[PDB]
């Protein structure tokens, strides 16, 4: 996919950011992922993000990140695939190429390792990786490599491959000042863990789709919120906020690392063994996860039937 | 008036934050800002805040404070005067108290000094200086004070009086949720330092005014922008923001404090005579005044007009 | 007492600042004060800061802070008095000269209220304070009131009553380089809300006595730890660390504002009447309060 | 080494943390770097970590730094050799196991990447990174992995080549804590950028050692500072800051990132070929260059 077409993709609706599955070793499960990027299929996403920060980019392996690319291509259909990608520049060109060799649709790219630095030299760490490949790139705004509005003119001047921009920094007096400067130059995406409780604001900012997290695994309801908000129907919105977002925000804060442990365990709740986080993250508590399947409540996909004799 | 009537107001259109006039021995020059306030009027805001946080409350001594309301109140004609309050319990209920028998509108209540506080305490805190009056209160999330939703919605219901919410935080996610709780009880009020930066996001949040500092001195440019954000004319706000707010940021962000300091230099620019900044914040340089000054640029006050 | 003799007397021991007596009504009880300030000079701290953080400056009245400041006067003896002071420039000023004028040996200059500050204001800010008394200054160097290096030395050189720099940012890397720039122009006070967490790694900065705010209601254990520091036992200050100040910490950790409230709670226990804090502080919990006495243990009074 | 003799080796005196030399192509240029390390093997730090944070540690391919820890072996001497390691576990125990390969005598563990992580999760990874070699560890407290005291006394208690805690917080009321629980345990030691701004203070603290970054370019300087440190000679420390410290944080104050690009560019004025950072650290302009070379002044190598 040439760059003009992802960007046309990541403009065209809600954005899926599947968990990586691991089998009961650790190891990546691609019969598991398959499985609930299949279901994900069925809600029409025009884009995926495989092995991006819900995906737990930061504790995989280099060499598992096409890996993953490939099974979710395997069962994506219609959809575009994204992959994560990071790191100090060597590696991020790296793994940059290689998931362009295996058919990647474009890059995601998160934050340089560690260090903060100067523009200057997020300016070159990023044309670097942007012309390593042909596949379209979205630069992430986030922790310790958050672009000024000059910085990324530049890098759209120079990268014609550079595409979205997505933010995680929550810093609307800066993405206002984004979009107004690149215009129709990039797509927006939103990008705060629980973006949905951000999504109104951002519309206002320029933006008009996000990550969603939890479309994971209430996808339904994840659908309806993003039809709520493109239609302008406030109070539909309103009443998912206060339904479902903050009681999981409330579940979400209890520790850190739970932007993604929540996610997981929503995923393991609706029938598809997502397995174990990998450390440093850590699983919500089996009483963390009742918490959650409570709150899914009338969304849940299946039922169990929990073990039980006379 | 009653909280009711200032909760109307407040949502009525452009919220304005008079700088405060100071002579060279640093005095109250309340000819001054009577002739500032009252060209300041003709652009109709329809709530004035009388020493906030623009008009230097952090270094006002308590009685200045109702004076200087009163010399707002003088001119200010049907727009309704809401005065600066803050400090701790004891210090904040006589300053309410002092300026609700001047006859102010209404209080925006700015945080506590220095210390952090448990949201229980913030609670008290509140609950006791809306208690002590009986004018409208709008509360201010900034700094040392932020509440949480549900502490506020306790306020809300055991304080009628309190009818406003102001943000200086910038923080959405928690913006949302209160007014997704609170909904019509409160009038939601957009409190970032330069507020137009913020104001198309804050309508999504469920905010449709704000405070806008530069109103002080470009009033057109600021009505001109506040018209075109309510009626969805995104190239106007646009081109606005370019032209004018991302430079003026610019010349803003040189120093701490300047966020007060750049508006009073506007101020003068335009030849109302504001003096001097008081003592921690500073004046710009020349050279500053001089990038204002060329900012200001076709929005210079002409004395033909 | 003349700034030099404060400046003297700040280098001569351990510092604390008593906390704020209040009735059932939060009103100022004097009475209660006294009888606590009169048990703390016997264990004979050189000067005793009225009306400071610990003492709930924030939450007080600027009319009520001489108010205080004499109290403390009363039965302070040998003990020096310096009185709290802050706010804006112009409330800062009426402090200061009001407090003077009921016999206060020195100011501590407490932040600004509310607004970040450019350093060429804070000079501005400092200096009026200062050329507005005669009595010694401390300033505070912490939350949105911090002095660089350059601009302290100005100040000091402009201002001869200037004599004491009081740290509560925690910051070592500019601690040292304002003993480094100042020498022995100014005395270094410690002022991290629990101290003696600090004062090890402080004295290598330069600084050689600090508040203890725990002073307030264990001034013997407060002693014995100070008296451990400056003889270099250092095993004797990590027993004292880790079987007193790490659990208090844990105790002050539960909520914002229990750096004050907790103290306060030990002076309650301890059967001086010091009543509530005020608000936006909140008291400690009857459970809380427990953990508190159960740690002051055998220097229960 | 063993674990305890590594221990014993950072408790032994000043710390080195090589740059990284580069070519102009960005290549590590080894030839360049083992000129510099023979260099500072004059000065006789008892420790050398290859790779680490002033060696960009965070800008090399993991394939890189067993070469790099190679090279710096070659002509260290009898200097213990730690390497840099970090990252996420599964990378970091793949570049431990290299490292060690090659003969390091331990490993500086820096943090996972990118992510805030509760203390369970921080045990589970460094734990596993340490049972994934027997050679030496030390943790470094900074950024987005800072252990608490209770957090560190099990992997204490759990991994007996855990030998060294570095410390990047600045955080006194926390150090001071994790050295009384911990004792003699642990090797202390001091790691703000700038060492030498803090170390007075942590001694205190319990500290007495630190990495020097400058012994990069001014050796003979970090020694004397180190020495008079240990000795007490408050003056002679004093006079060092006031007349080379301050006016070296000046300079690396004027960008992020110059704690690094500072000390390479000092490097390339005492005339070691270091060559350029790796983005995203940008070099010194050539005014700031001017700034650093007139403060080595009297310390300057050669003409």
Same mark, same amino acid.
């Given at each position: 996919?040439?760059?003009?077409?992802?960007?046309?993709?990541?403009?065209?609706?809600?954005?899926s950011?599947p968990?990586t599955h691991?089998?009961?070793?650790?190891?990546?499960a691609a019969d598991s992922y398959r499985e609930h990027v299949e279901w994900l299929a069925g809600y029409k996403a025009?884009?995926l993000?495989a092995?991006?920060?819900?995906?737990?980019?930061?504790?995989?392996?280099?060499?598992?990140?096409?890996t993953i690319v490939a099974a979710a291509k395997e069962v994506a259909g219609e959809t575009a695939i994204?992959?994560?990608?990071?790191?100090?520049?060597?590696?991020?060109?790296?793994?940059?190429?290689?998931?362009?060799?295996?058919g990647?649709?474009?890059?995601?790219?998160?934050?340089?390792?560690?260090?903060?630095?100067?523009?200057?030299?997020?300016?070159?760490?990023?044309?670097?990786?942007?012309?390593?490949?042909?596949?379209?790139?979205?630069?992430?705004?986030?922790?310790?490599?958050?672009?000024?509005?000059?910085?990324?003119?530049?890098?759209?001047?120079?990268?014609?491959?550079?595409?979205?921009?997505?933010?995680?920094?929550?810093?609307?007096?800066?993405?206002?000042?984004?979009?107004?400067?690149?215009?129709?130059?990039?797509?927006?995406?939103?990008?705060?863990?629980?973006? #949905?409780?951000? *999504?109104?604001?951002?519309? $206002?900012?320029?933006? @008009?789709?996000?990550?969603?997290? +939890?479309?994971? &695994?209430? /996808?339904?309801?994840?659908? #309806?919120?993003? *039809?709520?908000?493109?239609? $302008?129907?406030?109070? @539909?919105?309103?009443?998912?906020? +206060?339904?479902? &977002?903050? /009681?999981?925000?409330?579940?979400?804060?209890? *520790?850190?690392?739970?932007?993604?442990?929540?996610?997981?365990?929503?995923?393991?709740?609706?029938?598809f063994?997502?397995?174990?986080?990998?450390?440093?993250?850590?699983?919500?508590?089996?009483?963390?996860?009742?918490?959650?399947?409570?709150?899914?409540?009338?969304?849940?996909?299946?039922?169990?039937?929990?073990?039980?004799?006379?």
């Amino acid at each position: 996919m040439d760059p003009e077409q992802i960007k046309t993709a990541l403009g065209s609706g809600l954005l899926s950011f599947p968990v990586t599955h691991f089998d009961a070793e650790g190891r990546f499960a691609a019969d598991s992922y398959r499985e609930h990027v299949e279901w994900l299929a069925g809600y029409k996403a025009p884009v995926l993000f495989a092995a991006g920060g819900t995906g737990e980019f930061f504790s995989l392996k280099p060499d598992e990140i096409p890996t993953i690319v490939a099974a979710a291509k395997e069962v994506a259909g219609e959809t575009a695939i994204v992959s994560g990608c990071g790191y100090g520049t060597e590696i991020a060109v790296d793994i940059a190429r290689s998931v362009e060799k295996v058919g990647a649709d474009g890059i995601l790219l998160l934050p340089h390792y560690l260090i903060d630095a100067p523009q200057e030299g997020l300016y070159a760490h990023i044309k670097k990786v942007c012309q390593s490949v042909g596949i379209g790139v979205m630069v992430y705004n986030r922790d310790n490599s958050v672009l000024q509005a000059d910085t990324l003119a530049r890098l759209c001047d120079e990268c014609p491959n550079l595409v979205g921009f997505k933010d995680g920094t929550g810093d609307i007096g800066l993405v206002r000042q984004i979009t107004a400067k690149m215009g129709d130059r990039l797509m927006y995406l939103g990008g705060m863990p629980t973006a #949905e409780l951000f *999504a109104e604001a951002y519309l $206002g900012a320029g933006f @008009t789709t996000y990550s969603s997290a +939890v479309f994971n &695994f209430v /996808p339904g309801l994840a659908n #309806e919120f993003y *039809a709520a908000l493109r239609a $302008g129907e406030r109070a @539909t919105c309103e009443r998912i906020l +206060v339904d479902f &977002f903050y /009681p999981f925000m409330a579940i979400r804060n209890r *520790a850190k690392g739970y932007a993604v442990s929540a996610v997981k365990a929503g995923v393991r709740l609706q029938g598809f063994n997502a397995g174990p986080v990998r450390a440093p993250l850590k699983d919500l508590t089996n009483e963390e996860i009742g918490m959650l399947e409570a709150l899914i409540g009338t969304h849940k996909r299946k039922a169990w039937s929990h073990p039980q004799f006379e």
